Amino acid sequence: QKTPQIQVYSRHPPENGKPNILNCYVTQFHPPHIEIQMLKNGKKIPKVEMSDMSFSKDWSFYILAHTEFTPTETDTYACRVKHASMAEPKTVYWDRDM
Amino acid sequence: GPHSMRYFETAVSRPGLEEPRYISVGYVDNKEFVRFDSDAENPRYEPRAPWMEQEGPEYWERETQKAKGQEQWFRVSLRNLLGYYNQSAGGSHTLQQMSGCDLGSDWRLLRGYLQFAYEGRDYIALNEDLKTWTAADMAAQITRRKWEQSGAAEAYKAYLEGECVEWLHRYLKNGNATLLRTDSPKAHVTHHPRSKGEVTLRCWALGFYPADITLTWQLNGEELTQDMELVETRPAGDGTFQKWASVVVPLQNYTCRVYHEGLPEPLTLRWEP
Amino acid sequence: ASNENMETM
Known part of the structure; x- marks a missing residue:
């Protein structure tokens, strides 16, 4: 087992009111079985696209999850990951400056 | 190696089922060009690069027929690995394979690759000589011995030096400008x-x-x-x-x-x- | 073109 690394970030530089893509890049995990959820204000986003199953030269898996979003000043975004390697899910918040 | 071809193959055992989930991904210079997934509505090798779309239905049928044989190979090899590691069917297990070739600056075979992993760790790899094996631990020795005793490496050596180099040459010709892009x-x-x-x-x-x-x-x-x-x-x-x-x-x-x-x-x- | 494995593990 390898614990998943997560990066949460927009496809394009964010601008309040401009449609964009919010990404959740999950890497360095083994076994391939993973549960990825993207959240807005602590609520599950239903429309989340997953990239197909791929693995790196070190045998660990990676997957890009993304959703369409229009950033605002107040809305919060997060990505929550459930994996066998972790006792509890790991949540990463989107920071517009990262 | 300036140019390379690899097939990244995964078999994940599904508890309750006789068949595991099998996924195969082809790469040219680390860019995905083909894919097979037994979980698909119509399980078949599919183009994943535009320049691959020029290949006829005899190509995809052949490759798909290979993936069917690989599916059975990994199904049995998964079953045998349970024995070597004293595991039960009740759980999920992962068998991965990476294989292919690197071409030199002269476009000739630089070296062939054949590596296996069980549960995310090195299990068995073919050496650069393409006749000897490296086993990762003691359990991996059972496979190494079974493979030396059957001379399994010869058959891989032939694919690696022949078909592998042959098709890589084709894919580089057909894929032209997108590789250097x-x-x-x-x-x-x-x-x-x-x-x-x-x-x-x-x-x-x-x-x-x-x-x-x-x-x-x-x-x-x-x-x-x-x-x-x-x-x-x-x-x-x-x-x-x-x-x-x-x-x-x-x-x-x-x-x-x-x-x-x-x-x-x-x-x-x-x-x- | 992919390869077909020989002897099982």
């Missing part, structure tokens, strides 16, 4: 206040291809190793990549250097108003 990064510097008498300056690199890049920081022309924080290269999801590097610095007089194979020359950047 590049995208220059679009660099910008953001300003964020950190504490008292300090600021964080972030240098972004966006919209670049391939993923290889180098971002650095300088103060009066001098390099900063440990005192600089960065993110790992991440896909934008549009085919391009992103990366950033930041320095926590006390309140211009700070430069950033962007290095990408797509640039006519390196890029040097600094804070705006």
